[PDB]
Design a protein around this ligand. Sequence first.
Ligand SMILES: *[C@@H]1O[C@H](CO)[C@@H](O)[C@H](O)[C@H]1NC(C)=O
Ligand SMILES: *[C@@H]1O[C@H](CO)[C@@H](O)[C@H](O)[C@H]1NC(C)=O
Lengths: 50, 49
Amino acid sequence: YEDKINVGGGLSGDHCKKFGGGKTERARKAMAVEDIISRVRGGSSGWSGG
Amino acid sequence: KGSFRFSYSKNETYQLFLSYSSKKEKMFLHVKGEIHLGRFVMRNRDVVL
Ligand SMILES: *[C@@H]1O[C@H](CO)[C@@H](O)[C@H](O)[C@H]1NC(C)=O
Ligand SMILES: *[C@@H]1O[C@H](CO)[C@@H](O)[C@H](O)[C@H]1NC(C)=O
């Protein structure tokens, strides 16, 4: 504003903020159990085992 | 006459990134087989040498 005497004024304001977050988790598991048993009382010296 | 001027500017950029991975596998096993032929029973007492 200026009248009989001059007066000067000036102001400025600016602010900026940016936040960020990122997370990712991955997991994988697997289990398999296979057992085979064979008992033969056949009566041959070789063929029973064969 | 009078004229004053001022200018200020700031600028910031940060970035962070982290990654981790692990994989494991295990397999231990055993197999066996026997083909028997004949069994004997040695006499305990009254033995010849
Ligand atoms: C005044 O401030 C703004 C942000 O508030 C800026 O963009 C501009 O450059 C400034 N003026 C001058 C002359 O630097
Ligand atoms: C500086 O700040 C401005 C906000 O006015 C933004 O757009 C720009 O990306 C910033 N500079 C950098 C290098 O990030």
